[PDB]
Amino acid sequence: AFQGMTEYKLVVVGAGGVGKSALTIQLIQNHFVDEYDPTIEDSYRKQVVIDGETCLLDILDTAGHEEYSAMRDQYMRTGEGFLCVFAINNTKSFEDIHHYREQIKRVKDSEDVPMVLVGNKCDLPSRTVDTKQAQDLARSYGIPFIETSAKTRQGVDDAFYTLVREIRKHKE
Amino acid sequence: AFQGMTEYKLVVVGAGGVGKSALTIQLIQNHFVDEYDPTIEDSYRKQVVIDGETCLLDILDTAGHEEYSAMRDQYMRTGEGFLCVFAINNTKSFEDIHHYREQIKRVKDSEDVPMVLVGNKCDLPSRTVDTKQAQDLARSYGIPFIETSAKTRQGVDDAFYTLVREIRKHKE
Amino acid sequence: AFQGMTEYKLVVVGAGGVGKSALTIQLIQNHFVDEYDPTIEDSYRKQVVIDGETCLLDILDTAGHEEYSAMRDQYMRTGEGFLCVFAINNTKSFEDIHHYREQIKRVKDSEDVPMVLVGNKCDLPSRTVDTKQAQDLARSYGIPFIETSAKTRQGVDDAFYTLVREIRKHKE
Amino acid sequence: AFQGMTEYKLVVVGAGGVGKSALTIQLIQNHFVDEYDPTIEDSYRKQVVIDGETCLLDILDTAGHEEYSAMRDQYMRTGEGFLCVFAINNTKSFEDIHHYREQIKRVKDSEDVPMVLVGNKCDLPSRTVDTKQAQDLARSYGIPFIETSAKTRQGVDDAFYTLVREIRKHKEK
Amino acid sequence: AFQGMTEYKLVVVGAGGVGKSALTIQLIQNHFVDEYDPTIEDSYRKQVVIDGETCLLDILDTAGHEEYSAMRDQYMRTGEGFLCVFAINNTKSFEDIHHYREQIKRVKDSEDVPMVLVGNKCDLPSRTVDTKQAQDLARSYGIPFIETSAKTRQGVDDAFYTLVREIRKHKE
Amino acid sequence: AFQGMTEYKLVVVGAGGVGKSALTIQLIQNHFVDEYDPTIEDSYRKQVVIDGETCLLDILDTAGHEEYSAMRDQYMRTGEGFLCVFAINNTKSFEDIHHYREQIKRVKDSEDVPMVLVGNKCDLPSRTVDTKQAQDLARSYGIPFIETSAKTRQGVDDAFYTLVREIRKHKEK
Ligand SMILES: Nc1nc2c(ncn2[C@@H]2O[C@H](COP(=O)(O)OP(=O)(O)NP(=O)(O)O)[C@@H](O)[C@H]2O)c(=O)[nH]1
Ligand SMILES: Nc1nc2c(ncn2[C@@H]2O[C@H](COP(=O)(O)OP(=O)(O)NP(=O)(O)O)[C@@H](O)[C@H]2O)c(=O)[nH]1
Ligand SMILES: Nc1nc2c(ncn2[C@@H]2O[C@H](COP(=O)(O)OP(=O)(O)NP(=O)(O)O)[C@@H](O)[C@H]2O)c(=O)[nH]1
Ligand SMILES: Nc1nc2c(ncn2[C@@H]2O[C@H](COP(=O)(O)OP(=O)(O)NP(=O)(O)O)[C@@H](O)[C@H]2O)c(=O)[nH]1
Ligand SMILES: Nc1nc2c(ncn2[C@@H]2O[C@H](COP(=O)(O)OP(=O)(O)NP(=O)(O)O)[C@@H](O)[C@H]2O)c(=O)[nH]1
Ligand SMILES: Nc1nc2c(ncn2[C@@H]2O[C@H](COP(=O)(O)OP(=O)(O)NP(=O)(O)O)[C@@H](O)[C@H]2O)c(=O)[nH]1
Ligand SMILES: C[NH+](C)CCOc1ccc(C(=O)NC[C@@H]2COc3ccccc3O2)cc1
Ligand SMILES: C[NH+](C)CCOc1ccc(C(=O)NC[C@@H]2COc3ccccc3O2)cc1
Ligand SMILES: C[NH+](C)CCOc1ccc(C(=O)NC[C@@H]2COc3ccccc3O2)cc1
Ligand SMILES: [Mg+2]
Ligand SMILES: [Mg+2]
Ligand SMILES: [Mg+2]
Ligand SMILES: [Mg+2]
Ligand SMILES: [Mg+2]
Ligand SMILES: [Mg+2]
């Protein structure tokens, strides 16, 4: 017997200042946060319909640099899917992606963890990471790549919905 | 790709005057039709969420007594699930159920066709078919039984939703 | 920030066989359960809009009788509000309401716990508890009374929504 | 250009205690009001979909007996459609219906006002107005009749939606 | 009696690679398809509210270059409205528009077929078709012009909804 | 007690041609209006969910230059919140903001009126008002600033929803 909607536990990771919170707040509140208030840990929920199925997204917005690795391991174990976010004007955030990805694979003991690579701030003019390089990296991981802007809303729904679709594929 | 919601083709059958149209119109328009205007053939649509899945119900409301058996065979072949309706104050409509069920099995060439047995007009005081007898009949067919009233709306959503759940079970 | 809908933890209590599960399943699935499958402990969720506010109902469906429990107290203490259910054809279930109310006050350590008194099975002809008696009891507790039928769906939404309104009043 | 949903101004009238408020509160809040708190004047709104069209119902719930005639005239002039409610266990409320209908026609200076006749409290056992008599009355007016219960919710949505359908028909005359 | 939502049969036409599929998938799935998988024929559905009316969009996504004339004629006869798509960085796709428009008018035997002219890929910097020229072309046909991006979602809803509004105008 | 969704009366003001109508039509119809059809007065409605609460937005779209100051005063008195719109490629529309804000404060006799400063046409390349200047102005008023495009839809929902959030904050003071 159906006891209520399917729930998906999504975790947003990536370097400090890439726009993890801004992405999440744009999804939840349709609001662009212009201030940079560094996150410790925040949890959000939203019910959405994706491919005809109603679901409850439970979204954990994480800190760029996480002071306890015990707390990091805990959300990595609990998370069913991960948005790995870099900023397209910050080369270092892009180079950091491989470390977030390795950390997640180690904790989950798997090569095939649902993830989406997200290149955020695509509205800004000062691009330093080429779309082709990000696509190549994503292809090497076997995951989707989506360019986003928390400010214009480009790709924001798509990033979260795509991650849910990755989780569903992995669940069969 | 997901190309849009799942569609379910439902057919409502049963003897003249049992309330096939009234059930359908109550589901679609939240309206009780007090007049008895015999049906030839009418089709209705409604999008609903059942157990977290969005679907489009395509509902064929049939005539009690069908003049062309060619037209009957066509909707029976197209239908994915059947509400077999009798009126709880009309013993003959209940005895007719066996015949509707055999006709559907013959046309679809199957023993295992999604169906729900519906005892309608349960608001009326002159009951001639006992709940126990209908439950026994349904149990003998391996299908659900639901008591309904198109007038009070008791069981109306339940009858259609239960049929969708039967179709989904059969599809795996 | 708003971080997603408000959640309300509702607990359904009352004597064995009064229709606690049937009420809950009618709310969640729009389905009347005719069988009596005794509950140990089950949990349901549903997102609804009540007085213009979207919320997530977390509903705990309990057993009629765990004769001693440390375990019972623990799950009951999660509740923010309680539906106290009796059946209108079972005087003993009505007399038991006093004991469910005392148990709730003890576990929550409070005299003022959000609750609604629910008289279920109002469709049956074998009424033994009068509406006036139940209303008097509810008035003596300072809580709402609602007559329900899990079978006809009378009062089902109203019972749960009323409880949410009681919780909101208590929260201010 | 579409500027937002169509609005329909509905007025609920009828004798004191027939269930006008209980009907309206059942529609708006899915709540049965057991208490009898006589109304002075209350307004409610609800967005609904009727025959595939989204609309905003603005519902005026009136007093059974309206002491000052200026107030009554004002809402009758503003209302686009009227639910005329009686209780099926109260013959006097049923006999009053003709007078509510005449009062509406007088104030609006029209013979053709969208209305629905509503027989409420159909859950109660001591029925004194037969369904056939109400149907005959409604037929004599050329309007729909619906039996309702604010308690069980039978017919509640149907009554309000039917009234919207009557208003739409009148707007394409 | 209203028998369920109004259905609109929409057909998306235009040169190879202009983004017919990408537009449709963005509308249906909120997903940007970065890959170029040439279409043979795909059908999609979505229920939406446009100017307060609920409707069911049935969307036929066509091939740039259609190998069978019999298949082309069939969907052109069935389609109620047409999105004629070009890409704003592809002058040839813009010059092709009048051929798609003539083909539709010939098959439907009408001068007054509901259509919208869509300039897609408006996010790209390498624009070769001026907005003014497209507007002039649309004005010459008496139809709306909309600039879209399947990637950013600019204008995507607007293009489909505008076409529905054109169909509704033609239906009176 | 609950009588239907909460209503918010929003007024969109600012100089001629800044995109007041285009913003509103984008919100209501998901349609970009390319033509410049000067407004006299138009009213729009939309039901939305903001922070889990259902609300009915009643939006008054005003004329850039208002011929009767009696009519201006009336909508300013009725409005609960104001979107003050300039175009980011029109310096003069930005300098005019101060005047719309003063006019609103005068008519409402209050220093603390819910408002959002909206820099529209942010899709255009020919920017003449720097985001820093707009942010400073908004900070000086203690109100939010949002960059919008009626064409791309950037910030459109956010502008209206932010204004509702400002109204709600003011209603709990
Ligand atoms: N222009 C633009 N700015 C953005 C975008 N996303 C984020 N920003 C800006 O970048 C800054 C950082 O955003 P924030 O969401 O706080 O980043 P974060 O990744 O959560 N930081 P942390 O890990 O410290 O919690 C903010 O000032 C924000 O407005 C975007 O897509 N475009
Ligand atoms: N009291 C009551 N009357 C009902 C109920 N369902 C239908 N009716 C009434 O029964 C009569 C016939 O119903 P109808 O829907 O037209 O039956 P049908 O099975 O579609 N007839 P046909 O086969 O001729 O198309 C009508 O007078 C209708 O109002 C119900 O549940 N309760
Ligand atoms: N006629 C009628 N039967 C009801 C109603 N509610 C429940 N029932 C019937 O009563 C029986 C017991 O219902 P159930 O919901 O299992 O009761 P419960 O309170 O959950 N029992 P437990 O405490 O053991 O879990 C079932 O056969 C059910 O169909 C009602 O409103 N009307
Ligand atoms: N059993 C039952 N009781 C009802 C129904 N409708 C209303 N009542 C009861 O009838 C009494 C009066 O209802 P109320 O809605 O206040 O009537 P009203 O027509 O609004 N009165 P007034 O004209 O003074 O404002 C209340 O006790 C209410 O619970 C119904 O459908 N069923
Ligand atoms: N940047 C950008 N790329 C787009 C846009 N729309 C489509 N594309 C890209 O253009 C290519 C072709 O898109 P697709 O939808 O297959 O085009 P099509 O018109 O359906 N091709 P065909 O007629 O072969 O079926 C794809 O690479 C797609 O990513 C857009 O608006 N912006
Ligand atoms: N590129 C672009 N153009 C816009 C935007 N908003 C409005 N416009 C254009 O600017 C012109 C003016 O828009 P309009 O909405 O009529 O402005 P308005 O403030 O209502 N003028 P008025 O006060 O005369 O009623 C129109 O041609 C419109 O297409 C935008 O965000 N981007
Ligand atoms: C240690 N013993 C020697 C003495 C214990 O004596 C008693 C005597 C009476 C009681 C009592 O109040 N009975 C109520 C119980 C407990 O909870 C209930 C909850 C719901 C329904 C019935 C219930 O019955 C409980 C214990
Ligand atoms: C000094 N002021 C407080 C005066 C109040 O003035 C007025 C003036 C007019 C009105 C009015 O339109 N009354 C009729 C009512 C209002 O709501 C309605 C809603 C739905 C249907 C009819 C309605 O008619 C209500 C109040
Ligand atoms: C034995 N069967 C496989 C035969 C079915 O053959 C068919 C079925 C359908 C068609 C047909 O109508 N094609 C055009 C399409 C159908 O769907 C559409 C959806 C939306 C818009 C136009 C549409 O036109 C052509 C042949
Ligand atoms: Mg953060
Ligand atoms: Mg029929
Ligand atoms: Mg149980
Ligand atoms: Mg009243
Ligand atoms: Mg294609
Ligand atoms: Mg204007």
Numbering used by the authors:
A (entry chain C), B (entry chain D), C (entry chain A), E (entry chain F): -3 to 168
D (entry chain B), F (entry chain E): -3 to 169
Sentences copied from the publication:
Here, we employ the intracellular antibody to identify a compound from a chemical fragment library that binds to RAS proteins adjacent to the effector binding region. Our structure-based approach has produced compounds that bind to mutant KRAS with sub-μM affinity that interfere with RAS-effector PPI and endogenous RAS-dependent signalling in human cancer cells, and show a correlation between in vitro binding and potency in the cells. Although, various RAS inhibitors have been described in literature,24–32,47,48, in this paper we describe an approach for the development of RAS-effector inhibitors by combining different elements i.e. (i) the hit identification via a method of intracellular antibody fragment competition; (ii) structure-based design via crystal structures (KRASQ61HGPPNHP) and NMR (waterLOGSY and CPMG); (iii) identification of clear structure-activity relationship (SAR) for the development of potent compounds against KRAS and (iv) the proof of concept in mechanistic and phenotypic cell assays.
A chemical series was developed and representative structures are shown in Fig. 3a (Abd-4, 5, 6 and 7). In the development of the series, efforts were focussed on the right-hand side (RHS) of the molecule (i.e. substituents of the dioxane), since crystallography consistently showed electron density predominantly around the benzodioxane core. No H-bond interactions were observed between the benzodioxane rings and protein, with only van der Waals contacts with K5, L6, V7, E37, D54, I55, L56, G70, Y71 and T74. Therefore, efforts were directed to substitutions on the left-hand side (LHS), on the benzene ring of the benzodioxane main core, targeting interactions with K5, D54 or S39. An expansion of the interactions is observed when Abd-4 was evolved to Abd-7. The lowest-affinity compounds, Abd-2 and Abd-4, show no effect on cell viability even at the highest doses (these compounds also do not show activity in the RAS biosensor BRET assay).
